[PDB]
Each structure stands twice: as structure tokens, then as C-alpha cells.
């Protein structure tokens, strides 16, 4: 439904994010460390989406606050963006099924696929610098910019905005490592390769988490967890299983040697065949 995100301060932004999860996701008893606890997205009807207004970017005074993001609940994928100043709505090409009635919907050629966004940005998803003045410039460009595609400047705008929204909600590192950027020093955030790898493996990590029972050693793809704190801080929201989760592998998690191995990770390199025949010679 209607929502708003405040970038004014660390406490405000964190509280807004926690409100988003609390009103969206349900905490998991199996993973329940008192107040802090990962949560699972509550099942929602298909085609539903919430709306969040961007606020707190301009902390000096009320200004530059006419942007909204509409995001579905089914798999937590960016659906579209609304310019309230122009009272217009742009929808991702791959999100044609998702539409917002009551606003002037406008088709956008670009899709929401990560590969397309990286290509148009022409920059690796690790290493971008996000700052308040850069955020304001991107905001103003998008407000004045329009049409059927996002330009390269709009490419930075969209990648920066999606970075601070999707993984920020999904994962607890970004909010922890982006709050300082709001500080008086306001250090400029840098997207590290580890966070990129965690983002890429969101689906399988979320599929693995539900059967977690306070284990210590988790091993899923490029991702490994060796302590409870890391598990807590990695992901805060997971996909829904009922039966979209079950697509590859009857069970994705193997609890062996007090270790949770992803089934795909083990099966990938566990396929050695007859190979000494080469060394036998002609």
C-alpha cells in the first residue's frame, strides 16, 4: 500500500526499513534472536504491489520529494516508478503485467533485468559511489528526464536508486554500511564484491534459510557463513515457499558434519567421471 522512506537520518531510515519488514514480513521462530530476527515475506495475491515515496534526500528543507517507487510483493522486484510532480507512471518493460491504475502509465523500453541495467550503466555493479549531492543530481535528472528509455545519466540514476532499495531491504549489511553515509562526514558508499555476490544469490540463500535451525557452518554457492552474527546480518527477508521455491533440487540443504551445504554446490563438483584413461597413453 502507501508508504514513505526517509533518508533524513540514520535512525529515521533504519526505522522506516524496519517498519517495511514488520508490516510486510513475518518473523521466523526457528531464526528468532530476541528482538532481532530474520523474517519471511507473507504470501500475497498475485499482482499486488506497495508504493514508497522517496523522502529525506533533501534534509535542508522540503524539496525534491516527488518520486515514488511501486514494488510488487511476490518476489520483491522493482516494478515501476511514478513522478508525482508530473502525475505520471513509468513501468518496466518486463513488468508489463504489473500496472498501477489511476495514474498516467507510460511504457519504458528498458526492462528491470539486472544484466540490462549493468549494460546500460556500462559499469561493474561493484565499486559505484553514492553521495547526497549525486543522489540529488540523479533525482533532478530523472524528474526533468522522460520518454521511453533511461539514458546513461538516467542509467546511473536508476542503478543507484535500485541499489539503495532492493538489497537495502533484503540485506542488513547495506543499511548497516550505508547509515554512516548519512552521517556528518557522510562517507561515500562503495559497492563491494562480497555484497554483490550476496545479492546475486538471494534466491537460493532465501530457499536455504527456512530449514536453518541455528546452525553455524552454512555453505551455499559463493556464500559461506561461519557465525551467527554473519547469518543475522546477511539477509533479513526471504522469498515465499508453498510451490515456486521448489524448482531445482528436491532439497537444497544438506545438514552434514554440523554444516549446511547447498545441494547444487556439492553436486556441481561431485561429478568426476573416468578420467585416468587419458593418462594410460595410446
Amino acid at each position: 500500500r502507501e508508504f514513505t522512506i526517509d533518508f533524513s537520518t540514520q535512525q529515521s531510515y533504519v526505522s522506516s526499513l524496519n517498519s517495511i519488514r514488520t508490516e510486510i514480513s513475518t518473523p521466523l521462530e526457528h531464526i528468532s534472536q530476541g528482538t532481532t530476527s530474520v523474517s519471511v515475506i507473507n504470501h500475497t495475491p498475485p499482482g499486488s504491489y506497495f508504493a514508497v515515496d522517496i523522502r529525506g534526500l533533501d534534509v535542508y528543507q522540503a524539496r525534491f520529494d516527488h518520486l515514488r517507487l511501486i514494488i510488487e510483493q511476490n518476489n520483491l522486484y522493482v516494478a515501476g516508478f511514478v513522478n508525482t510532480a508530473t502525475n505520471t507512471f513509468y513501468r518496466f518493460s518486463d513488468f508489463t503485467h504489473i500496472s498501477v491504475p489511476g495514474v498516467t502509465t507510460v511504457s519504458m523500453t528498458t526492462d528491470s533485468s539486472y544484466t540490462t541495467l549493468q549494460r546500460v550503466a556500462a559499469l561493474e555493479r561493484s565499486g559505484m559511489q553514492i553521495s547526497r549531492h549525486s543522489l540529488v543530481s540523479s533525482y533532478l535528472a530523472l524528474m526533468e528526464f522522460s520518454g521511453n528509455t533511461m539514458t546513461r545519466d538516467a542509467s546511473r540514476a536508476v542503478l543507484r536508486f535500485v541499489t539503495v532499495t532492493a538489497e537495502a531491504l533484503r540485506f542488513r549489511q547495506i543499511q548497516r554500511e550505508f547509515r554512516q553515509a548519512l552521517s556528518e562526514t557522510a562517507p561515500v558508499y562503495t559497492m563491494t564484491p562480497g555484497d554483490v555476490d550476496l545479492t546475486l544469490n538471494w534466491g537460493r540463500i532465501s530457499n536455504v534459510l527456512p530449514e536453518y535451525r541455528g546452525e553455524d557452518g552454512v555453505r551455499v554457492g559463493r556464500i559461506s557463513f561461519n557465525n551467527i552474527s554473519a547469518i543475522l546480518g546477511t539477509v533479513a527477508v526471504i522469498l515465499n515457499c508453498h510451490p515456486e521455491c521448489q524448482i531445482t533440487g528436491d532439497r537444497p540443504v544438506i545438514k552434514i558434519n554440523n554444516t549446511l551445504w547447498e545441494s547444487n554446490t556439492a553436486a556441481a563438483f561431485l561429478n568426476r567421471k573416468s578420467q585416468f584413461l587419458y593418462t594410460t597413453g595410446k
Partner: peptide, 6 residues
């Protein structure tokens, strides 16, 4: 008082 966790 968000501790090191936050």
C-alpha cells in the same frame, strides 16, 4: 543506541 549490529 543501535550497537554494532546497527
Amino acid at each position: 543506541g543501535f550497537g554494532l549490529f546497527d
